[PDB]
Amino acid sequence: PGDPQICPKRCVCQILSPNLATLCAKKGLLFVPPNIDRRTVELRLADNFVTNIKRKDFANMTSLVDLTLSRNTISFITPHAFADLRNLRALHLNSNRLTKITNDMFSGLSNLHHLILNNNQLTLISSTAFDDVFALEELDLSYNNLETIPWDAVEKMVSLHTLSLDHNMIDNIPKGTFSHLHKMTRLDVTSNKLQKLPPDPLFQRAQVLATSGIISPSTFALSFGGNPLHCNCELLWLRRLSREDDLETCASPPLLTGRYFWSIPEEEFLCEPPGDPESNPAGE
Amino acid sequence: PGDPQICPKRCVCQILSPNLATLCAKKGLLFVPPNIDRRTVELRLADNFVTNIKRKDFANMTSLVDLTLSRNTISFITPHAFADLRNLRALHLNSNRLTKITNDMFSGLSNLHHLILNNNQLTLISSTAFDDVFALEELDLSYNNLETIPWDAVEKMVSLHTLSLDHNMIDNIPKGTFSHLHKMTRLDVTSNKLQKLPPDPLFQRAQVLATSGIISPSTFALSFGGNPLHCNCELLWLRRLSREDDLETCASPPLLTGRYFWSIPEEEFLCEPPGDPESNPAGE
Ligand SMILES: *[C@@H]1O[C@H](CO)[C@@H](O)[C@H](O)[C@H]1NC(C)=O
Ligand SMILES: *[C@@H]1O[C@H](CO)[C@@H](O)[C@H](O)[C@H]1NC(C)=O
Ligand SMILES: [Ca+2]
Ligand SMILES: [Ca+2]
Ligand SMILES: [Ca+2]
Ligand SMILES: [Ca+2]
Ligand SMILES: [Ca+2]
Ligand SMILES: [Ca+2]
Ligand SMILES: [Ca+2]
Ligand SMILES: [Ca+2]
Ligand SMILES: [Cl-]
Ligand SMILES: [Cl-]
Ligand SMILES: [Cl-]
Ligand SMILES: [Cl-]
Ligand code: NA
Ligand code: NA
Ligand code: NA
Ligand code: NA
Ligand code: NA
Ligand code: NA
């Protein structure tokens, strides 16, 4: 309807026509203010103490595009809370207390290009949780407890140019995930449990080359440092890249344990014919 | 013995007589280097990826004073790991993955004046864990999951001048804890579950006073903001202090819900004679 504009007592509401924005940031709120005009395009709740997301909070916000909950203490989100936002392109949940991501949490958002989850305690993400977010251009999981993510849903995100997994428990990356993703310019796996990384043509751009007539800048940013790397032939493709030394370190095999990844010559990365690994490349 | 000095390959060892220091910081280590001279006074491991503390790591370090493990990913500490350090005055565990503090973890350290635990996932601290640390001048629990701490052990720390509890789940502070602690200059309870705060004479110094012939600086730093304050007569002593407005907010009673703590007049903080609280001050 054509009702007059609603603004919470503690917030500031801006109208730059047609758009309307509700800025509540750093007001000390313990919960989402009850009266927020449903026509708000941008909603800034960041740097508050809100602990809970009620179903009624964001209900019926059709034109809502940016929503920033960052730096709140949030342990719970009522199901179907975001179910009413079709137009939301960006959502910032970072620096909260979320321990889990359910299937129904993000289920409604088709138009979302940015999902920022970093600096939470999340130990788990449900299998279908990312099925509807396939339009994401940015996904930040950094600084969490995750040992795995819905890889099958991630390999279906075509336009994603940034994936930040750093500072997690992730022990494995499936081998074919990035094949169909040609927009990815950034992957940060730093401080994880990875013993191995899958080869991808994208990673061929993670090195600097020159003296061909042009000095080629690095067009892909990859950081694998801080992982318990098991150093064998499977990582040789990575050892062949010409890169800065980030102090990456091999966890295994025992003779390579403790030594810098780039300080090891290429000839000393060895796979053992048939238990390292385990018809591997030697053949059997 | 008089053995030659041991230094790890990746570290730098300084001798300023008599003292010896081993600086391993930011070397990318996945574990504590095995050879570290047992006579080291200061050991800097910060900004590494070490995940585990073995019994042998710090064993037999008698003269060790400062030990900084900060900004590591550490989920486990072998029992009796610190049992051999009598002279340790400072220990920095901050920014790690520790989820728990056992009874045997700190059991050995009498001389410890500084314990920095901030930015961990700790949900629990065992009842006797702090019994031996009674000499602590600084204890930083900030940014954790704690709902309670060994208050009985804390009220026995006489020389403690700083306690940082901020950004936790703590729902209650016992009423008599700070009575015997006259050295405390700082308490940060910000972003907790506290509905109430106990009155203490120390908190009488948390306000600024002037026009008596001297403008008195604030000699005690207290931050209670970001708590679900239940606003009744029990907090009146706090409302009487003349302080900056940090945007503290009452969670309850319903008529005070959402309103700024300092925007409420003193006459509107009311306790109800006999269920708020519950022979309370009205008498029964
Ligand atoms: C959402 O919309 C429905 C109908 O469109 C209405 O009944 C309900 O009260 C609305 N809720 C909010 C929080 O606006
Ligand atoms: C610690 O000292 C004991 C005896 O003093 C010795 O047997 C043991 O090997 C030492 N361990 C380390 C790690 O220095
Ligand atoms: Ca964009
Ligand atoms: Ca495929
Ligand atoms: Ca393709
Ligand atoms: Ca690790
Ligand atoms: Ca000191
Ligand atoms: Ca007492
Ligand atoms: Ca006394
Ligand atoms: Ca809170
Ligand atoms: Cl927090
Ligand atoms: Cl974390
Ligand atoms: Cl970490
Ligand atoms: Cl935290
Ligand atoms: Na906050
Ligand atoms: Na946080
Ligand atoms: Na390994
Ligand atoms: Na680190
Ligand atoms: Na951390
Ligand atoms: Na309350």
Residue numbers in the entry:
A (entry chain A), B (entry chain A): 14 to 287, 312 to 315, 360 to 365
The authors write:
SALMs, also known as leucine-rich and fibronectin III domain-containing proteins, are a family of newly characterized SAMs that belong to the type I transmembrane proteins. Members of the SALM family are predominantly expressed in the central nervous system (CNS) and known for their engagement in neurite outgrowth, synapse formation, and synapse maturation. LAR-RPTPs are type I transmembrane proteins and share a common domain architecture of an ectodomain containing up to three immunoglobulin-like (Ig) domains and up to nine fibronectin III (Fn) repeats, followed by a transmembrane domain and tandem intracellular phosphatase domains.
Except two loops, most residues in the Ig domain of SALM5 were not determined in the free SALM5 crystal due to lack of density, suggesting dynamic movement or multiple conformations of the Ig domain. As demonstrated by crystal packing analysis and structural superimposition, the free and PTPδ-bound SALM5 structures unanimously revealed that two SALM5 molecules form a diad dimer through their LRR domains packing in an antiparallel side-by-side manner. The two protomers in the SALM5 dimer are related by a twofold axis, and the dimer interface buries a total of ~2200 Å2 solvent accessible surface area (SASA) with a long list of residues involved. The LRR domains of two SALM5 molecules constitute a concave platform as the core of the dimer, with approximate dimensions of 56 Å × 68 Å. The SALM5 LRR-Ig totally adopts a totally all-β fold, with the overall structure in an L-shape. In the site A, two sets of ascending loops in the LRRs 3–6 are intertwined at the dimer interface, and an extensive hydrogen network is built by engagement of residues R110, Q134, and N158.
